[PDB]
Amino acid sequence: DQNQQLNEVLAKVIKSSNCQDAISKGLHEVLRTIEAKQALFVCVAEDCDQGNYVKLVKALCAKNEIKYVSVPKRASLGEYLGHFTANAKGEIKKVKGCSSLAIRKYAPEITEDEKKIIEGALKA
Amino acid sequence: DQNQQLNEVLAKVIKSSNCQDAISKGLHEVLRTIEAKQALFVCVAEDCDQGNYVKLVKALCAKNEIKYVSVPKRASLGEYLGHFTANAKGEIKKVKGCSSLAIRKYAPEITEDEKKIIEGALKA
Amino acid sequence: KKKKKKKSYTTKKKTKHRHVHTKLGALAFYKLENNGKVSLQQKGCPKCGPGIFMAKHYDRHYCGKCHLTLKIDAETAKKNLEELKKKQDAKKS
Amino acid sequence: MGRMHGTLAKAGKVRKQTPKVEKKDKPRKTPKGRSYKRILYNRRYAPHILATDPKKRKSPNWHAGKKEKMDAAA
Amino acid sequence: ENETKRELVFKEEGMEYAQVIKMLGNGRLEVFCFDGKRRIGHICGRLKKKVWISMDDIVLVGLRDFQDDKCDILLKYLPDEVRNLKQYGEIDENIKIND
Amino acid sequence: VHVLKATKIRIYKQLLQDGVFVLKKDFEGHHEETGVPNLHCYILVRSLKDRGFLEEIFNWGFTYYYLNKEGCEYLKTKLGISADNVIPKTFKASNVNFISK
Amino acid sequence: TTRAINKKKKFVADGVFNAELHSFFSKSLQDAGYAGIEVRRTPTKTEIRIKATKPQQVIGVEGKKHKELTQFLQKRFGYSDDQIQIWAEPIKFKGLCASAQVEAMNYKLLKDVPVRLAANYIIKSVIQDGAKGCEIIISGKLKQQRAKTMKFKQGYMICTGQPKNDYIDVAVRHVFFKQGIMGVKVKIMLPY
Amino acid sequence: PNKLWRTHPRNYGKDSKECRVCGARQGLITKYEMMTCRRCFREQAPHIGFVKYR
RNA sequence: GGGGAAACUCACGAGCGCAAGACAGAGAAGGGAUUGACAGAUUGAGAGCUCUUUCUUGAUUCUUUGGGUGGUGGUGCAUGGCCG
Ligand SMILES: [Mg+2]
Ligand SMILES: [Mg+2]
Ligand SMILES: [Mg+2]
Ligand SMILES: [Zn+2]
Ligand SMILES: [Zn+2]
């Protein structure tokens, strides 16, 4: 198990920070968001192809100061962001995978215990 | 919910019986597999087009003796059988849908409780 | 009364700038060494500096945000102009 | 009056132009013979119709369409 | 002065351009057709209403398959539609349009 | 023309909170209360009536929009978590009657 | 004080306010018979009495239309919540109100109910409520593509004189059809 | 890059104003600061409180 | 025709700019839809209009297939209202 609490709190956080303007999405977006030290916490998609993307991102989190999380699949990122093409049956079909997500700020409806749950997965 | 236990036990069963030679696949295969009374249990794909396929199959299960299960979608059958075209990212894309599956025998790694779980969905 | 005439074309139709985007191009800004150090091989903007990179056109440094313009010494300008010219002559042919 | 396409006086014009619409396939059929006049008597001269106000009696073709058969049955 | 601009309509197949020759009555006329034949035209129920036609006007004429000798007056051209026809190269450049 | 995210949110916010929105026609000016450039309001609200969450009435240069129940359900969606709690000032039921002899 | 305003320019401005209200209410209130509006103005408040045939639809389902309206006036002019007050007042005799009755035949004509019958229904209603006389004018295409004008009188009617402005109540409506706009006037001469 | 939109001065003259009701610029009545075209005025006149005694 | 028009008005004319092309279906998009803009040409015009030039920006959507907004465009012999 991916530890459903981790993926659930991750889902609620990425949703919350998207409904509010403060999420950030994309390798150019996440770039400057990391460098400006705006990003409080950042998510990396593990499976994807250019050695650079993951290397540069993890290294940039290390090279200013940022904590990161590692998600196995990209379609999960796209889904969490609410990037999906929804069928009229309420079925989510087409999902554009993401690579890196930078959350600039947190939405106030975040529970203390949930945040304390996030903080454990934040390594490096 | 499709009752994730049902789809999970179904998945483990169809996999197990494919890794072992004793699964059977196809309307000509499932035909003789039903008629020879070899099939212990059979799976039908609900959505598909010829009125015949579903009618004949359900009627053949009734007309010797066989218990059947009803899966809503065909791509799910194809996936369970391990019929998929896998992307180098570990992403399953192309899936050839099935219609009818006949499991000749069960693999010994089947749990008692799992089998007792199967038996409930077997109606008609 | 009067009616609108059928339209007369005087001068040729004009095309609009599409947006040039190099795919996953944002990786061209940073280089990594074996230690893992992060090296910036573009130029950052003195006002916008941490995350935003300026543009190196041959003679100018230009910020996409604050429109900062920093003009180069003319020799570097001529050298870069000449080089890029000689390269485009090659790619176009 | 500046709309003209076809030649005036062409022979088959209006009939050729008319789209071909197919006659609807009827569920079951229309009873031939006596039974039909039974049907007519029923929907027309039957006791219940007579019982209603003869000046307020409803004219036989009043409904072309089915929405008023739904409004008639209610 | 003019009625609303509408597209100058060309001779479709089954029609011919014509110039009014003389006036008959009952809404009839003799026309010279650029087919090269003279014909005796009748005026449209449409045109009888709208556009008054007279001598040496340039008109569009709907033809008849069976009787070639009769033809129907379809539409009258405004002198500008005509000069335009000459421009386009539909009808011959030597023709007399009077105002 | 780009209607920025915070613009969008700000107006959806004010909608859900109030339940009613008002627009003078000029695309030049700004909306008095929310202080938003009008073209942007016109756009958001335009789409909102075009999907039926909004019902529109027009008086002396001013368009008046009032929210439907489908509206609550749209705004819940785009504003997410925040909108779990809220019912608009329109939807709140008045407890006292205004009809006087 | 707020601003020193021309008694003339102020008063004209007050009238223009009133008219804007009347247009707003006749326009947004169109389903319940709307007659009139009466505006009292206090340094504290602005009180609006909406005189109407069906107050029940002015209020709505527990102040759906009421709250909507009140907030509309609020966003429009800018107002404190204590500064605006809306009351709805019933018109005790619906037969003596024109705007109401014209709304009635608006309605009946939308449902394709024939002219003479509808006109008669309302006229009979109006006189049933004690009005000395009434008249209805319907203009526009009725029969065909060529415009007609049909008048229906019963009872007592005055047109000319200052008494006109007193006893006669008039309202018009534009009525919409697939064919175009047709239109309808109702003149109820009131009783003494 | 609509920057040039409406950028000609409407400060004064005919385009500075309009009917509050019908938004006409023509034959506008500005006289009591009531900003209403002649037709629209003629209509609203009894609601504004303008009688014809005369 | 409140018809005293320098711009505006304004429908006319010559040359340029925007989209305020909603909404639905299909495909495209987060590894990028799209916005913006120094500077050189360019232009009547510090209209990034175009072209070279890249940097920004981060779904506010792009391409088709439908389709709405908008129209001082027509028709007072389709009409309301008003008015002679
Ligand atoms: Mg003049
Ligand atoms: Mg229209
Ligand atoms: Mg125009
Ligand atoms: Zn800068
Ligand atoms: Zn006006």
Coordinates of C-alpha atoms in Angstrom, one line a residue, chain D residues 24-31 66:
Chain D
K24 CA -43.9 4.9 -40.7
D25 CA -43.9 1.2 -40.1
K26 CA -47.1 0.5 -38.1
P27 CA -47.1 -1.7 -35.0
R28 CA -49.7 -4.3 -35.7
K29 CA -52.4 -3.2 -38.2
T30 CA -55.6 -1.4 -39.1
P31 CA -58.6 -3.8 -38.8
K66 CA -49.7 12.4 -30.0

